[PDB]
Design a protein around this nucleic acid. Structure first.
Lengths: 174, 209, 341, 166
RNA sequence: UUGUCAGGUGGGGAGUU
RNA sequence: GGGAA
C-alpha cells in the first residue's frame, strides 16, 4: 500500500477517460462511502475507506490484494493489464457494442471482434476509441479498442475487423 | 435578458429558446446549456424547465454526427433529484414552458423523450430512476400515477424489479441501494390503500401484468 | 484374493470377526488400518460398511450461483439453454445447483467465466449458511482458500461490510484473489498471515468469524484418496492441535460487544470425533465466555455427547455433522459459538 | 465442399446435419419436437442437430442399422429402422408421450440404375412412413428425404391424405 | 465523548551504514 | 423441346 501521487494519477486518469470518459466523477467521489483509490506494489486498487483502515494493519509486502484492481503500473505507466474492473467499466461505459453468439467465443478467447460478428453499436463511435463489449444478455465481456466507426461500419465487409481485443472475461479462469 | 432578470416570464423564454435553438450556430449550442445549468442556486418548476429544454436541445437531429458532447448528465441528475420536491409540494389541475402547462405534463414529457432516446437508457439506469418515480407517485391524481406506471408498462426493457428491491441506487443516492441482490421479488402494496378506489385496481393490474 | 470373495467375506462378517472384516475392508478399499479402525469405531458396523461403500461413489457436481451477479432461475435457464442438466440442491439451499449431465465444460461456460456460477462442494455451502453473515458487518475468514466460502459470505452480505480473508499458502491465496475478482466481491481484503497470530498481530474485533480449519480429509476421501493411506496418528494429533489453536485465536479475535453478535463458526472437512468434538470441547473449556448455539441447519447429524470413554458436554449435540452415506454430501462438521464477554 | 468444411470446423459429422438445421430454421419443427425419432440416423449428424435444437430432456431416439456414436440424452439404437424389435424399443421409451416429429434419412447405395435407386429410396421412405403413423401423435411432423422420380408424385399424394400440410 | 497502555502497518517523514 | 415441381 502506497498513496498515489499526482503524476501517476493524471497518468491513469486519462486512461480511464478513453473508456468511461468523464464518468469517472461518480467513482472518485461518493459521499455515502469515501471509497478512494489505493496503490499496492504496481497494482492500483480501488477500495473503500474501511478497506484501507483494515489494510493499514496488514503489511505492504504481505497484503497482495485489496478491493478491485484497475491494472498494474507498468514502466510506461499504463493499465488494462487486469480486467477485474470490467464491472465498473461496463456500468459507467460511454460506448458499448453488442457481439452476437458467433462473436462471443472468439472474443472470449481474445480474438478481435469480426465485422460479421458485430451485433449492435452505439451509432456514434469514433476511430481508436475505448469501448466496452457486451453480449445479448446485457453482460459485460471485456475492453476493446475500435478503429471503425458506425458511419462506415454500417456498410462493411463481414470478414473485416472492427474492435481489437484488449481483455476478456475468459482471462478470469484462463 | 429575461433569463438574467429571473422574472416570472422564464417560462416563455425557455419556450422560445427550445423552439429556436436548432436555428442557431453550433458553437452556441454548447454554451446554451451553461446558462440553463447556472440557475441551480417556483424554484423546482424553473429547474424543470431548464432540464426539459436541455433535453430538447440535445434532442436535435444529427447531434451524433456533431459530437458536441457537453455531458447533459448534470441535467439528468437534476431531474433525478427534483422529483422528490415535486412529490412534496401540492398540485391542483383545477378544471375548464417547454410546450405545454400543468407541470406534471412536462415530467411525463421529459420521461417520454427520455424513453424516446435511442438506447440511451434501460441500461440498469432506468430502473434506478423509476424506483424514485414510484416513490414520488405516493400522491398526485391517479391518472398521473397511472401515466408514469404506464411508461414503464410500455417500456421495451424487460426489467421487472423496478417496483421492488433493485440494484444500487447511485447518483445522489438517498434511497435503498440493495447492491448485488438479483432477486425477482413494495410501493404498490401501500398504493392499494388510497383515497380513490381505482388506485387499488391499478395496483392489481400492475402486479398481474 | 478376489475382490468379489473379499466383498462376500466382509458382508458375511458384517452380518455376523472384527479383525477379518477390517482386513477385508483394507484389502478392498485400500484404506490404512488405522483409518479403517477409526471409522469402524466411530460408526456402526453397518454404518461403517455403508460409509466405506459411499466413499468410492463419485459425489455429484455442485455449483453455487452468485446472487451478486445473477438469479438462480436465470442461471438454471442459461444452463438449460447450454444443454446442461441441473437441478436444485434440495430445499436447504435455494442457490445450490447439482449438475448431472453437461455437454459443454462446466467451468468453461460463458456464465462460469462471467462469474454467474462457481463450482463448489455442497458441504462448503453449509458453512456459509451456518455463519449467516449480515450486511455492513466485519467478517474475518481464517482460511480463505479456495475462496468459495468467502464469495458466498460476500453474496449473503450483498457486497456490504468488510470481509477480511486470510490464506496461509501464497499459491492458494493468488487463486482465491482471482476467484474473488471474477465473482466481483468489492469489499474483500485478502491477507497471507497465520491464523493464530491474526487475532493479536494483525487485527481483532471481527463481528463474525468463519474458521474453515484444515482437516485430515476423512470426509474428502473421494476427492483425495491419498489421505486414506497417508493418515497417521501423529499427523492427526498435529491437525487437532492446529485446529484448537485456530479456534482459540478466532474466539479471541471475535468481539463479544459487536452489535451483530460475536458469532464464530468452525468448520472441518473430516468426520473424526477427535477432530470435531474434542476441539469443540477444548475450545469451550479454554473460553468459558463462548457458548454453543444452534447452527440452524435443517440437515446434519447431531454432535456426539459420549463416544467410547470420551464424554462431551451436553451442548455439543448442537453441532451439525454430515456424512456421504447420510446426507449424500462430503463429510463435514459445523459448530457455532457465541461470545458473551 | 464448403458445407463439408464447416462440418469439420464446427464438429458436425456430415453435411446432412447442416441440411437438418436449415429445415429447423425454416420450419421450426425441431424446436417444438418434444419427442424426436430419427430413422437412418447414421453417422449421427441428424441426431446431433435434433439434440441441439430440441430442449434438453426431450425424447431423442435415433435408430439406424449402422453403428452410431453415443450422444448425451439420446438413445442410439443400432438396428433396422422399422424392425419389430426396434419398434418395441421406440414404444418402450415413448410410454405416455407420443412421437411428435420424425426425421428420416434413408439413403440406398449407388451403383445401379437411377430408377432402381429412386424407387429404393421411395419405398424405404413409404415403409418408414409406415412406422410413423403407427407411432405419431395427432398433429405430428414427419421430415423425410426423398429422391425425385415418377413415383414422387404418387408419394406426395399419400403424404397429402395422411398429413394435413406438405 | 475524551485521555492511557500494548500491537500491526509503515522509499510517507526524520536519523544511521 | 414439352410437362411437373
Amino acid at each position: 500500500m502506497r498513496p498515489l501521487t499526482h503524476e501517476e494519477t493524471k497518468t491513469f486518469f486519462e486512461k480511464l477517460a478513453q473508456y468511461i470518459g468523464k464518468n469517472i466523477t461518480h467513482l472518485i467521489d461518493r459521499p455515502d462511502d469515501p471509497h478512494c483509490f489505493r496503490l499496492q506494489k504496481d497494482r492500483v486498487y480501488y477500495v473503500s475507506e474501511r478497506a484501507m483502515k483494515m489494510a493499514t494493519s496488514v503489511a505492504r509486502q504481505n497484503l497482495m490484494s485489496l478491493g478491485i484492481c484497475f491494472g498494474k503500473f507498468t514502466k510506461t505507466n499504463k493499465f488494462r493489464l487486469h480486467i477485474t474492473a470490467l464491472d465498473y467499466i461496463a456500468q459507467y461505459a460511454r460506448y458499448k457494442i453488442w457481439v452476437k453468439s458467433n462473436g462471443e467465443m472468439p472474443f472470449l478467447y481474445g480474438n478481435h471482434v469480426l465485422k460479421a460478428h458485430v451485433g449492435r453499436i452505439t451509432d456514434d463511435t469514433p476511430q481508436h476509441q475505448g469501448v466496452v463489449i457486451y453480449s445479448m444478455n446485457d453482460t459485460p465481456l471485456g475492453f476493446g479498442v475500435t478503429a471503425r466507426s458506425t458511419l462506415e461500419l454500417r456498410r462493411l465487409e463481414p470478414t473485416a475487423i472492427v474492435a481489437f481485443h484488449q481483455a476478456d472475461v475468459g482471462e478470469y479462469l484462463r | 435578458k429575461t433569463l438574467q432578470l429571473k422574472g416570472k416570464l422564464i417560462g416563455n423564454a425557455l419556450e422560445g429558446v427550445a423552439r429556436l435553438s436548432h436555428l442557431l450556430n453550433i458553437e452556441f449550442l454548447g454554451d446554451l446549456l451553461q446558462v440553463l445549468r447556472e440557475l441551480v442556486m417556483q424554484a423546482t418548476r424553473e429547474a424543470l424547465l431548464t432540464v426539459s429544454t436541455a433535453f430538447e436541445i440535445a434532442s436535435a437531429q444529427g447531434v451524433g454526427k456533431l459530437n458536441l458532447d457537453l455531458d447533459l448528465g448534470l441535467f439528468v441528475q437534476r431531474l433525478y433529484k427534483i422529483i422528490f420536491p415535486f412529490s412534496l409540494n401540492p398540485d391542483a389541475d383545477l378544471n375548464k414552458v417547454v410546450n405545454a402547462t400543468t407541470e406534471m405534463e412536462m415530467l411525463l414529457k421529459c420521461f417520454q423523450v427520455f424513453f424516446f432516446k435511442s438506447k440511451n437508457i434501460s441500461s440498469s439506469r432506468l430502473s434506478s430512476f423509476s424506483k424514485r418515480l414510484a416513490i414520488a407517485s405516493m400522491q398526485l391524481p391517479e391518472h398521473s400515477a397511472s401515466a408514469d406506471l404506464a411508461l414503464l408498462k410500455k417500456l421495451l426493457s424487460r426489467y421487472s424489479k423496478l417496483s421492488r428491491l433493485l440494484t444500487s441506487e447511485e447518483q445522489i443516492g438517498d434511497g435503498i441501494y440493495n447492491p448485488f441482490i438479483e432477486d425477482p421479488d413494495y410501493e404498490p402494496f401501500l398504493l392499494k390503500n388510497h383515497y380513490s378506489p381505482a388506485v387499488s385496481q391499478s395496483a392489481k393490474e400492475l402486479l398481474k401484468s | 484374493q478376489d475382490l468379489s470373495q473379499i466383498q462376500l467375506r466382509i458382508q458375511e462378517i458384517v452380518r455376523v470377526y472384527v479383525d477379518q472384516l477390517l482386513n477385508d475392508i483394507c484389502a478392498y478399499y485400500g484404506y490404512s488400518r488405522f483409518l479403517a479402525e477409526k471409522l469402524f469405531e466411530l460408526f456402526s458396523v453397518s454404518e461403517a460398511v455403508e460409509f466405506f461403500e459411499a466413499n468410492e461413489m463419485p459425489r455429484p457436481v455442485t455449483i453455487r450461483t452468485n446472487t451478486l451477479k445473477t438469479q438462480r432461475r436465470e442461471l438454471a435457464q442459461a444452463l438449460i439453454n447450454r444443454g446442461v442438466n441441473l437441478e436444485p440442491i434440495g430445499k436447504w439451499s435455494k442457490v445450490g445447483l447439482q449438475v448431472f449431465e453437461s455437454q459443454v465444460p462446466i467451468g468453461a461456460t460463458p456464465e462460469y467465466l462471467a462469474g454467474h456460477y462457481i463450482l463448489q462442494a455442497a458441504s462448503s455451502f453449509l458453512p456459509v449458511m451456518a455463519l449467516a453473515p449480515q450486511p455492513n458487518e466485519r467478517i474475518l475468514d481464517m482460511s480463505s482458500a479456495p475462496g468459495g466460502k468467502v464469495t458466498y459470505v460476500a453474496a449473503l452480505q450483498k457486497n456490504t461490510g468488510i470481509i477480511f480473508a486470510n490464506d496461509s499458502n501464497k499459491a492458494r491465496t493468488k487463486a482465491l484473489s482471482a476467484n474473488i475478482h471474477r465473482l466481483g466481491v468489492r469489499n474483500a481484503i485478502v491477507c497471507n498471515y497465520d491464523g493464530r497470530k491474526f487475532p493479536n498481530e494483525v487485527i481483532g474485533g471481527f463481528d463474525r468469524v468463519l474458521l474453515d480449519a484444515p482437516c485430515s480429509g476423512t470426509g474428502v476421501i473421494y476427492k483425495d484418496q491419498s489421505v486414506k493411506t497417508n493418515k497417521s496418528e501423529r499427523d492427526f494429533d498435529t491437525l487437532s492441535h492446529l485446529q484448537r489453536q485456530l479456534l482459540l485465536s478466532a474466539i479471541d479475535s471475535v468481539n463479544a460487544d459487536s452489535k451483530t453478535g460475536g458469532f464464530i463458526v468452525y468448520s472441518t472437512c473430516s468426520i473424526t470425533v477427535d477432530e470435531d468434538e474434542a476441539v469443540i470441547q477444548y475450545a469451550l473449556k479454554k473460553r468459558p465466555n463462548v457458548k454453543l448455539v444452534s447452527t440452524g441447519l435443517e440437515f446434519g447429524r447431531e454432535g456426539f455427547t459420549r463416544f467410547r470413554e470420551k464424554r462431551f458436554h451436553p451442548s455439543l449435540k448442537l453441532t451439525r455433522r454430515y456424512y456421504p452415506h447420510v446426507h449424500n454430501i462430503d463429510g463435514f462438521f459445523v459448530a457455532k459459538l457465541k461470545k458473551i464477554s | 465442399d464448403k458445407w463439408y468444411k464447416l462440418a469439420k470446423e464446427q464438429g458436425y459429422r456430415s453435411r446432412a446435419a447442416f441440411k437438418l438445421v436449415q429445415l429447423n430454421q425454416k420450419y421450426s419443427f425441431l424446436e417444438k419436437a418434444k419427442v424426436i425419432i430419427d430413422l437412418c440416423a447414421a453417422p449421427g449428424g441428424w441426431l446431433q442437430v435434433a439434440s441441439k435444437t430440441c430442449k434438453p430432456g426431450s425424447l431423442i431416439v435415433g435408430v439406424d442399422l449402422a453403428p452410431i456414436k453415443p450422444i448425451p440424452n439420446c438413445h442410439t439404437f443400432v438396428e433396422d429402422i422399422t424392425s419389430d424389435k426396434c419398434r418395441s424399443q421406440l414404444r418402450g421409451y415413448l410410454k405416455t408421450w407420443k412421437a411428435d416429429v420424425v426425421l428420416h434419412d434413408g439413403a440406398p447405395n449407388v451403383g445401379s440404375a437411377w430408377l432402381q435407386d429412386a424407387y429404393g429410396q421411395a419405398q424405404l421412405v413409404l415403409m418408414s412412413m409406415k412406422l410413423a403413423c403407427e407411432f405419431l401423435v395427432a398433429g405430428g411432423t414427419f421430415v423425410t428425404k426423398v429422391f425425385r422420380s415418377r413415383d414422387y408424385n404418387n408419394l406426395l399424394w399419400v403424404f397429402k391424405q395422411l398429413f394435413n400440410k406438405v
